[PDB]
Amino acid sequence: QLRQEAEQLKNQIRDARKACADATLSQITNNIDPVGRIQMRTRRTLRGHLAKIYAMHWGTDSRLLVSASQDGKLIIWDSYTTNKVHAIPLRSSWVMTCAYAPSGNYVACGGLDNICSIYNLKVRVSRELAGHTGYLSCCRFLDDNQIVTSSGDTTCALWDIETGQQTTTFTGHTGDVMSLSLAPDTRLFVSGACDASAKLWDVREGMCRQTFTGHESDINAICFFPNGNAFATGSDDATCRLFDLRADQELMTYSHDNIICGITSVSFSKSGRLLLAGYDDFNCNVWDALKADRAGVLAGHDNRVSCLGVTDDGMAVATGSWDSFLKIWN
Amino acid sequence: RKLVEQLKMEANIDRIKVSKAAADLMAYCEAHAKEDPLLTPVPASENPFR
Amino acid sequence: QRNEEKAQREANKKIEKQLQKDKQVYRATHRLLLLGAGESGKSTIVKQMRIGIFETKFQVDKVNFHMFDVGGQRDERRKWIQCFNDVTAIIFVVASSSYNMVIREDNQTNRLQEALNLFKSIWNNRWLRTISVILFLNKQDLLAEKVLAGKSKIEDYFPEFARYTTPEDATPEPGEDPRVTRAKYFIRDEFLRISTASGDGRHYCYPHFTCAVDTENIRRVFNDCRDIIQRMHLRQYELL
Amino acid sequence: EVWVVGMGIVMSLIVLAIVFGNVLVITAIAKFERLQTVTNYFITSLACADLVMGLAVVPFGAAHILTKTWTFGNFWCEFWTSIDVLCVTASIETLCVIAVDRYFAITSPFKYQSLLTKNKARVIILMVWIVSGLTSFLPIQMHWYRATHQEAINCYAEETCCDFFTNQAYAIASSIVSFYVPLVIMVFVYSRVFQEAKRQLQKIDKSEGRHKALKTLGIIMGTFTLCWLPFFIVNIVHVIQDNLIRKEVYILLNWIGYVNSGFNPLIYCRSPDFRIAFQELL
Ligand SMILES: CN[C@@H]1CCc2c(ccc(O)c2O)[C@H]1O
């Protein structure tokens, strides 16, 4: 009975979104000069992983990074000197994500075991977080005391380290969520599921204010614009899209006729001009956010890339691939 | 169920025209473009890696 | 000063040695994935092989084998199936006696047909393009008791069985009726038809008939893994 | 004149082909980190030996053949002979080692990962290079190989002309260390590998009712045998009976053995990854 009302309200919201748009981003930004071709060289090549890497997270100082591999080792690296500060074995051989706390004291880790493991650097496991039906997919730290984990149970949850019990749970995703990204002020929060919909959550209220379903296939990556008023979602439809929270709709789509492979990880530059996206075609393509025209190609990886993180300083870009090699670019 | 209530809550949100948001993003990119080592190739002396 | 650099170099050396030993250990061990239907009977095979993720370590002929099984994640689309890309073989367990019964509450969508569709999805996967499948057909004696009874006819559920004939170059059991042999070989050929179409020398399907009290599953998996690695190495050198 | 320039053109083309193929192979393994494989270490060693051959002995041998005299010093002639023996022994023994590694990888798949590591490959390469260097330099530089008849004494005394004269014992030892024993090992391991491949093909045919190995082993064995075996059989013969084998046929078979090294990159680097690396480099 309520399905008709829901459809009518969805049509109304679509009409409102259409009426709220006058000129696309391309129309307003075609006047400014293009960024031009970009040359990026592998300054540091970090070797040591036994198996493929899935994710990594740069430290706050933009110097140290933590990388997770299916061998079960959560290796911490010093990008400047290419030295392994720590090597943390994992209880679960399969790992799907990792995190680096802003303070740098704690490092998170979770995989197919449905348990979020948190390690204390200054190395033994501090707290193991349980309560997720499906496999964990991404974890990030709001601060040294809280962490948000999104699992295959189609639910994103906010945990507390001291208590070990989730403070709140976010529901409303048809498919399992695959990625998330915290806001710069940590007030807001987004996650991209497999139902081609990316939802903006709220760590305080716990209700998704907005949902964007411009994609055609499952979403594999997501990341805020540095301003915090926009985010980019990378799906398997070979397209990267830049949504806008204030406009509640898509702005630009990044695609080419040559590429027919999905996107694994998406990250912005410090100023947000460059939208770096890691592809399934063994290379990473960098885009112009205001132009949608690809500038450079990072084809140094032998196998598929699985992660991509730009430093907080905006100095280097690190891409970890399936060939057990994590390369630093600049 | 609760889906209709959630979508009704989603619908009643104030929105701004896409022109304003696009202009704001463009202005942010233009204003903060100076402090971007990726856009402007940093000199080897300034580059910490090499 | 340089003392910090020296300490960091010492830590790097220790970590490098530890990961060298870990690499030796990891390359020594082989990985397997236990995939099957919920009521297929993987528990019986797991118990036989042993004697949110379940991992059992068993070794035969001084060769370490690792078996991974996940059952919490049950969805039409699986993202964890792309994670198992370095496994030597994917063990598939199918209930060969579940042809006449349906669990989806819909007509003609038999559990055997669902298992066949799952096998097709696993085989025709971009990431699983070099992973062989060791197929186990559990509960062969239940299938025998069903076929020797007139309760269910396969032709009513599987139309191709009406015109199907037993292979001349087959290997019937020492004590088995012609009817049960025809049924089991048709069920095996149903999977083998999907197996032959897609893969081209990259990976193969190994079908085995297993009862509820079979104890040779450990040796069968060992032989199948040996053949898989031999075929992979032979193709890498462009011989086979 | 016309005969000399044609032969000079042929030897120049052979030198160019050998050097180009070898530098391409070492560039392919060295430049790309995805080609760094345990077996690829042995392939790199083989390509390095072939490159040293084609850079050192083939050009000087061509100069000796065309000019009909040895302008350089007698000590340099001894060094050139030693380098040639080193290159030949290293190349053939590395081919044997690659065949052995394939045999272990196929016959014993479970133990192959543990049996061969980077350290084991490095120590095997060092051992083969040391044994080749021994067999080359130790008998030659210490003059163990020199003959006793007056023809050899006159040949070694004159600095202008520097031909090859070997003792029967040294010829037998050099042949049995360079070619014959590696030939036996390669034939045995490749027969076992062919038997295993036939067994696997029979198993596949039996399980799945609904030639390539023979061709690959045929090319691998036939190229090496046709390239080297005639030279080593005449190497044995002319020391067994001097009157049977002339110098021209001996030099011709030796140069066939030389040009063998050109085909090794075209045979042992036909993998799709190697083709992709070649396309990227070129
Ligand atoms: C100068 N020609 C040398 C003479 C003897 C000799 C060769 C190659 C391999 C051997 O084991 C040898 O004993 C020839 O290349």
Coordinates of all heavy atoms in Angstrom, one line a residue, chain A residues 132-204, unseen atoms left out:
Chain A
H132 N 29.6 -7.8 13.9 CA 29.2 -7.6 12.5 C 28.9 -9.0 11.8 O 29.7 -9.9 12.0 CB 30.4 -6.9 11.7 CG 30.3 -5.4 11.7 ND1 29.3 -4.7 11.1 CD2 31.2 -4.5 12.2 CE1 29.5 -3.4 11.3 NE2 30.6 -3.3 12.0
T133 N 27.8 -9.0 11.2 CA 27.4 -10.3 10.5 C 28.3 -10.6 9.3 O 28.8 -11.7 9.2 CB 25.9 -10.2 10.1 OG1 25.1 -10.1 11.2 CG2 25.5 -11.5 9.3
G134 N 28.5 -9.6 8.5 CA 29.3 -9.7 7.3 C 30.8 -9.3 7.5 O 31.2 -8.8 8.5
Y135 N 31.5 -9.5 6.4 CA 32.9 -9.1 6.4 C 33.1 -7.6 6.5 O 32.3 -6.9 5.9 CB 33.6 -9.7 5.1 CG 33.1 -9.0 3.9 CD1 33.7 -8.0 3.3 CD2 31.9 -9.5 3.3 CE1 33.2 -7.4 2.1 CE2 31.4 -9.0 2.1 CZ 32.1 -7.9 1.5 OH 31.6 -7.3 0.4
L136 N 34.1 -7.2 7.2 CA 34.4 -5.8 7.3 C 35.0 -5.3 6.0 O 35.6 -6.1 5.2 CB 35.4 -5.5 8.4 CG 34.7 -5.1 9.8 CD1 34.3 -6.4 10.5 CD2 35.7 -4.4 10.6
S137 N 34.8 -4.0 5.7 CA 35.3 -3.5 4.4 C 36.2 -2.3 4.5 O 37.2 -2.2 3.8 CB 34.1 -3.2 3.5 OG 34.6 -2.7 2.2
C138 N 35.9 -1.4 5.4 CA 36.7 -0.2 5.7 C 36.6 0.2 7.1 O 35.5 0.1 7.7 CB 36.3 0.9 4.7 SG 36.8 0.7 3.0
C139 N 37.6 0.8 7.7 CA 37.7 1.3 9.0 C 38.4 2.6 9.0 O 39.5 2.7 8.4 CB 38.3 0.3 10.0 SG 37.8 -1.4 9.7
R140 N 37.9 3.6 9.7 CA 38.6 4.9 9.9 C 38.3 5.4 11.3 O 37.4 5.0 12.0 CB 38.1 6.0 8.9 CG 38.2 5.5 7.4 CD 39.7 5.6 6.9 NE 39.8 5.0 5.6 CZ 40.5 3.8 5.5 NH1 41.0 3.2 6.5 NH2 40.6 3.3 4.3
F141 N 39.2 6.3 11.8 CA 39.2 6.8 13.1 C 38.6 8.2 13.1 O 39.1 9.1 12.4 CB 40.6 6.8 13.7 CG 41.1 5.5 14.3 CD1 41.5 4.5 13.4 CD2 41.1 5.3 15.6 CE1 41.9 3.3 13.9 CE2 41.6 4.1 16.2 CZ 41.9 3.1 15.3
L142 N 37.6 8.4 13.9 CA 37.1 9.8 14.2 C 38.1 10.5 15.1 O 38.4 11.6 14.9 CB 35.7 9.8 14.8 CG 34.6 9.8 13.9 CD1 34.4 8.4 13.2 CD2 33.3 10.2 14.6
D143 N 38.6 9.7 16.1 CA 39.6 10.2 17.0 C 40.3 9.0 17.6 O 40.2 7.9 17.1 CB 39.0 11.1 18.1
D144 N 41.1 9.2 18.7 CA 41.8 8.1 19.3 C 40.8 7.2 20.1 O 41.2 6.1 20.6 CB 42.9 8.6 20.2 CG 44.1 7.7 20.3 OD1 44.1 6.7 19.4 OD2 45.0 7.9 21.1
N145 N 39.5 7.6 20.2 CA 38.6 6.9 21.1 C 37.5 6.2 20.3 O 36.8 5.3 20.8 CB 38.0 7.8 22.1 CG 37.2 7.1 23.2 OD1 37.3 5.9 23.3 ND2 36.4 7.9 23.9
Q146 N 37.2 6.6 19.1 CA 36.1 6.0 18.3 C 36.6 5.6 16.9 O 37.7 6.0 16.4 CB 35.0 7.1 18.1 CG 34.7 7.9 19.3 CD 33.4 8.7 19.2 OE1 32.4 8.2 18.6 NE2 33.4 9.9 19.6
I147 N 35.9 4.7 16.3 CA 36.2 4.1 15.0 C 34.9 3.7 14.3 O 34.0 3.2 15.0 CB 37.2 2.9 15.1 CG1 37.4 2.3 13.8 CG2 36.7 1.9 16.1 CD1 38.4 1.2 13.8
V148 N 34.8 3.9 13.0 CA 33.6 3.5 12.2 C 34.0 2.4 11.3 O 35.0 2.5 10.5 CB 33.1 4.7 11.5 CG1 32.0 4.2 10.5 CG2 32.5 5.7 12.4
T149 N 33.3 1.3 11.4 CA 33.5 0.1 10.6 C 32.3 -0.2 9.7 O 31.2 -0.3 10.3 CB 33.9 -1.1 11.4 OG1 32.8 -1.4 12.3 CG2 35.1 -0.8 12.2
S150 N 32.5 -0.4 8.4 CA 31.4 -0.8 7.5 C 31.6 -2.2 7.0 O 32.7 -2.5 6.5 CB 31.3 0.2 6.4 OG 32.5 0.1 5.5
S151 N 30.6 -3.0 7.2 CA 30.8 -4.5 7.0 C 29.8 -4.9 5.8 O 29.1 -4.1 5.2 CB 30.5 -5.3 8.2
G152 N 29.8 -6.2 5.6 CA 29.0 -6.8 4.6 C 27.6 -7.1 5.0 O 26.7 -7.6 4.3
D153 N 27.3 -6.8 6.3 CA 25.9 -6.9 6.8 C 25.0 -5.7 6.4 O 23.9 -5.5 6.8 CB 26.0 -6.9 8.4 CG 24.6 -7.0 9.0 OD1 23.8 -7.8 8.6 OD2 24.4 -6.2 10.0
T154 N 25.5 -4.9 5.4 CA 24.8 -3.7 4.9 C 24.6 -2.7 6.0 O 23.7 -1.8 5.8 CB 23.5 -4.1 4.2 OG1 22.5 -4.2 5.2 CG2 23.6 -5.3 3.4
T155 N 25.4 -2.7 7.0 CA 25.3 -1.8 8.1 C 26.6 -1.2 8.5 O 27.6 -1.9 8.5 CB 24.7 -2.4 9.4 OG1 25.6 -3.4 9.9 CG2 23.4 -3.1 9.1
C156 N 26.7 0.1 8.7 CA 27.9 0.8 9.2 C 27.6 1.2 10.6 O 26.6 1.6 11.0 CB 28.1 2.1 8.4 SG 28.0 1.9 6.6
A157 N 28.7 0.9 11.4 CA 28.6 1.1 12.9 C 29.7 1.9 13.4 O 30.8 2.0 12.9 CB 28.6 -0.3 13.6
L158 N 29.4 2.6 14.5 CA 30.4 3.5 15.2 C 30.7 2.8 16.5 O 29.9 2.6 17.4 CB 29.9 4.9 15.4 CG 30.5 5.8 16.5 CD1 31.9 6.1 16.1 CD2 29.7 7.0 16.8
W159 N 32.0 2.5 16.7 CA 32.4 1.7 17.9 C 33.1 2.6 18.9 O 33.4 3.8 18.7 CB 33.5 0.6 17.5 CG 32.9 -0.3 16.5 CD1 33.1 -0.3 15.2 CD2 32.2 -1.6 16.8 NE1 32.5 -1.4 14.6 CE2 32.0 -2.2 15.6 CE3 31.8 -2.2 18.0 CZ2 31.3 -3.4 15.5 CZ3 31.1 -3.4 17.9 CH2 30.9 -4.0 16.7
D160 N 33.2 2.1 20.1 CA 34.0 2.8 21.2 C 35.1 1.8 21.7 O 34.8 0.7 22.0 CB 33.0 3.1 22.4 CG 33.6 4.2 23.3 OD1 34.7 4.7 23.0 OD2 32.9 4.6 24.2
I161 N 36.3 2.3 21.8 CA 37.4 1.4 22.1 C 37.4 0.9 23.5 O 37.5 -0.3 23.8 CB 38.8 2.2 21.8 CG1 38.7 2.9 20.4 CG2 39.9 1.2 21.9 CD1 38.3 1.9 19.3
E162 N 37.1 1.8 24.5 CA 37.1 1.5 25.9 C 36.0 0.5 26.2 O 36.3 -0.6 26.8 CB 37.0 2.7 26.8
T163 N 34.8 0.8 25.8 CA 33.7 -0.1 26.1 C 33.7 -1.4 25.2 O 33.3 -2.5 25.7 CB 32.4 0.6 25.9 OG1 32.1 0.8 24.5 CG2 32.4 2.0 26.6
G164 N 34.1 -1.3 24.0 CA 34.1 -2.4 23.0 C 32.8 -2.7 22.4 O 32.7 -3.7 21.7
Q165 N 31.8 -1.9 22.7 CA 30.4 -2.1 22.2 C 30.1 -0.9 21.3 O 30.4 0.2 21.6 CB 29.4 -2.2 23.3 CG 28.1 -2.9 22.9 CD 27.0 -2.7 23.9 OE1 26.4 -1.6 24.0 NE2 26.6 -3.8 24.6
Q166 N 29.4 -1.2 20.2 CA 29.1 -0.2 19.2 C 28.1 0.8 19.8 O 27.1 0.5 20.4 CB 28.5 -0.9 18.0 CG 27.2 -1.6 18.2 CD 26.7 -2.3 16.9 OE1 27.3 -2.2 15.8 NE2 25.6 -3.0 17.0
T167 N 28.4 2.1 19.6 CA 27.6 3.1 20.1 C 26.3 3.2 19.3 O 25.2 3.3 19.9 CB 28.3 4.5 20.1 OG1 29.3 4.5 21.2 CG2 27.3 5.6 20.3
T168 N 26.4 3.2 18.0 CA 25.2 3.3 17.2 C 25.4 2.5 15.9 O 26.6 2.1 15.6 CB 24.9 4.7 16.8 OG1 23.8 4.8 15.9 CG2 26.1 5.4 16.1
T169 N 24.3 2.1 15.2 CA 24.4 1.4 14.0 C 23.6 2.2 12.9 O 22.5 2.7 13.2 CB 23.8 0.0 14.1 OG1 23.9 -0.7 12.9 CG2 22.4 0.0 14.6
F170 N 24.1 2.2 11.7 CA 23.5 2.9 10.6 C 22.9 1.8 9.6 O 23.6 0.9 9.2 CB 24.5 3.8 9.9 CG 25.3 4.6 10.8 CD1 26.7 4.6 10.7 CD2 24.7 5.5 11.7 CE1 27.4 5.4 11.5 CE2 25.5 6.2 12.6 CZ 26.8 6.2 12.5
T171 N 21.6 2.0 9.3 CA 21.0 1.0 8.4 C 20.2 1.8 7.3 O 19.9 2.9 7.5 CB 20.0 0.1 9.2 OG1 19.1 1.0 10.0 CG2 20.7 -0.9 10.1
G172 N 20.0 1.1 6.2 CA 19.3 1.7 5.1 C 19.9 1.3 3.8 O 19.4 1.8 2.7
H173 N 20.9 0.5 3.7 CA 21.6 0.1 2.5 C 21.0 -1.3 2.1 O 21.1 -2.3 2.9 CB 23.1 0.0 2.7 CG 23.8 1.3 2.2 ND1 23.6 1.8 1.0 CD2 24.6 2.1 2.9 CE1 24.3 2.9 0.9 NE2 24.9 3.1 2.0
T174 N 20.6 -1.4 0.8 CA 20.1 -2.7 0.3 C 21.2 -3.7 0.2 O 21.1 -4.8 0.6 CB 19.4 -2.5 -1.1 OG1 18.4 -1.5 -0.9 CG2 18.9 -3.8 -1.6
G175 N 22.3 -3.3 -0.4 CA 23.5 -4.1 -0.6 C 24.6 -3.8 0.4 O 24.5 -2.9 1.2
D176 N 25.6 -4.7 0.5 CA 26.7 -4.6 1.4 C 27.5 -3.4 1.0 O 27.8 -3.1 -0.1 CB 27.5 -5.8 1.4 CG 27.9 -6.3 0.0 OD1 27.3 -5.8 -0.9 OD2 28.7 -7.2 -0.1
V177 N 27.9 -2.6 2.0 CA 28.8 -1.4 1.8 C 30.2 -1.9 1.6 O 30.7 -2.8 2.2 CB 28.7 -0.5 3.0 CG1 27.3 0.2 3.0 CG2 28.9 -1.2 4.3
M178 N 30.9 -1.2 0.7 CA 32.3 -1.5 0.4 C 33.3 -0.5 0.7 O 34.5 -0.8 0.7 CB 32.4 -1.8 -1.1 CG 31.3 -2.7 -1.7 SD 31.6 -4.5 -1.2 CE 33.4 -4.6 -1.2
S179 N 32.9 0.8 1.0 CA 33.9 1.8 1.3 C 33.2 2.9 2.1 O 32.0 3.1 2.1 CB 34.5 2.4 0.0 OG 33.6 3.0 -0.7
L180 N 34.0 3.7 2.8 CA 33.6 4.9 3.5 C 34.7 5.9 3.5 O 35.8 5.6 3.3 CB 33.1 4.5 4.9 CG 34.0 3.9 5.9 CD1 34.8 5.0 6.7 CD2 33.2 3.1 6.9
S181 N 34.3 7.1 3.9 CA 35.3 8.2 4.1 C 34.7 9.2 5.0 O 33.6 9.7 4.8 CB 35.6 8.9 2.7 OG 34.6 9.7 2.3
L182 N 35.5 9.6 6.1 CA 35.1 10.6 7.1 C 35.2 12.0 6.5 O 36.1 12.3 5.7 CB 35.9 10.4 8.4 CG 35.4 9.4 9.4 CD1 34.0 9.9 10.0 CD2 35.2 8.0 8.8
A183 N 34.4 12.9 7.0 CA 34.5 14.3 6.7 C 35.7 14.9 7.4 O 36.2 14.3 8.4 CB 33.3 15.0 7.1
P184 N 36.3 16.0 6.9 CA 37.4 16.6 7.5 C 37.1 17.0 9.0 O 38.0 16.9 9.8 CB 37.7 17.8 6.6 CG 37.2 17.4 5.3 CD 36.0 16.6 5.6
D185 N 35.9 17.5 9.3 CA 35.5 17.8 10.6 C 34.9 16.7 11.4 O 34.5 16.9 12.5 CB 34.6 19.0 10.6 CG 33.3 18.7 9.8 OD1 33.3 17.8 9.0 OD2 32.2 19.3 10.1
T186 N 34.8 15.5 10.8 CA 34.2 14.3 11.3 C 32.8 14.4 11.7 O 32.2 13.6 12.4 CB 35.0 13.8 12.5 OG1 34.8 14.6 13.6 CG2 36.5 13.7 12.2
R187 N 32.1 15.5 11.3 CA 30.7 15.7 11.7 C 29.8 14.8 10.8 O 28.9 14.2 11.3 CB 30.3 17.2 11.5
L188 N 30.1 14.7 9.5 CA 29.4 13.9 8.5 C 30.2 12.7 8.2 O 31.3 12.5 8.6 CB 29.0 14.7 7.3 CG 28.4 16.1 7.5 CD1 28.0 16.7 6.2 CD2 27.2 16.0 8.5
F189 N 29.6 11.9 7.3 CA 30.1 10.5 7.0 C 29.4 9.9 5.8 O 28.2 10.0 5.7 CB 30.0 9.7 8.2 CG 30.3 8.2 8.0 CD1 31.6 7.8 7.7 CD2 29.3 7.3 8.0 CE1 31.9 6.5 7.5 CE2 29.6 6.0 7.8 CZ 30.9 5.6 7.5
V190 N 30.1 9.3 4.9 CA 29.4 8.7 3.7 C 30.0 7.3 3.5 O 31.0 6.9 4.0 CB 29.7 9.5 2.4 CG1 29.1 10.9 2.5 CG2 31.1 9.5 2.0
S191 N 29.2 6.5 2.8 CA 29.5 5.1 2.6 C 28.9 4.6 1.3 O 27.7 5.0 1.0 CB 29.1 4.1 3.7 OG 27.7 4.2 3.9
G192 N 29.6 3.9 0.4 CA 29.1 3.4 -0.8 C 28.8 2.0 -0.9 O 29.8 1.2 -0.6
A193 N 27.6 1.5 -1.1 CA 27.2 0.1 -1.1 C 27.3 -0.4 -2.5 O 27.7 0.2 -3.4 CB 25.9 0.0 -0.4
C194 N 26.8 -1.7 -2.6 CA 26.7 -2.4 -3.9 C 25.4 -2.1 -4.6 O 25.3 -2.6 -5.7 CB 26.9 -3.9 -3.7 SG 28.7 -4.4 -3.4
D195 N 24.5 -1.4 -4.0 CA 23.2 -1.1 -4.7 C 23.4 0.2 -5.5 O 22.3 0.8 -5.8 CB 22.1 -0.9 -3.7 CG 22.5 0.0 -2.5 OD1 23.5 0.7 -2.6 OD2 21.7 0.1 -1.5
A196 N 24.6 0.6 -5.9 CA 24.9 1.8 -6.7 C 24.4 3.0 -6.0 O 24.1 4.1 -6.7 CB 24.2 1.7 -8.1
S197 N 24.3 3.0 -4.7 CA 23.9 4.2 -3.9 C 24.9 4.5 -2.9 O 25.3 3.7 -2.1 CB 22.5 3.9 -3.3 OG 22.6 3.0 -2.2
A198 N 25.3 5.8 -2.8 CA 26.2 6.3 -1.8 C 25.3 7.2 -0.8 O 24.7 8.2 -1.3 CB 27.3 7.1 -2.4
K199 N 25.4 7.0 0.5 CA 24.6 7.7 1.4 C 25.4 8.5 2.4 O 26.5 8.0 2.8 CB 23.7 6.7 2.3 CG 22.6 6.0 1.5 CD 21.6 5.5 2.5 CE 20.3 5.0 1.7 NZ 19.3 4.3 2.6
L200 N 25.0 9.7 2.7 CA 25.7 10.5 3.7 C 25.0 10.3 5.0 O 23.9 10.6 5.2 CB 25.6 12.0 3.3 CG 26.2 13.0 4.2 CD1 26.9 14.1 3.4 CD2 25.2 13.6 5.1
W201 N 25.8 9.8 6.0 CA 25.3 9.5 7.3 C 25.5 10.7 8.2 O 25.9 11.8 7.8 CB 26.0 8.2 7.8 CG 25.8 7.0 7.0 CD1 26.6 6.4 6.1 CD2 24.6 6.2 7.0 NE1 26.0 5.3 5.6 CE2 24.8 5.2 6.1 CE3 23.3 6.3 7.7 CZ2 23.8 4.2 5.8 CZ3 22.4 5.4 7.4 CH2 22.6 4.3 6.5
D202 N 25.4 10.4 9.5 CA 25.7 11.4 10.5 C 26.1 10.7 11.8 O 25.4 9.9 12.3 CB 24.4 12.3 10.8 CG 24.7 13.5 11.7 OD1 25.9 13.6 12.2 OD2 23.8 14.3 12.0
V203 N 27.3 11.0 12.2 CA 27.9 10.2 13.4 C 27.1 10.6 14.7 O 27.2 9.8 15.6 CB 29.4 10.5 13.5 CG1 30.1 10.0 12.3 CG2 29.6 12.0 13.7
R204 N 26.4 11.7 14.7 CA 25.7 12.1 15.9 C 24.3 11.7 15.8 O 23.8 11.0 16.7 CB 25.8 13.7 16.0

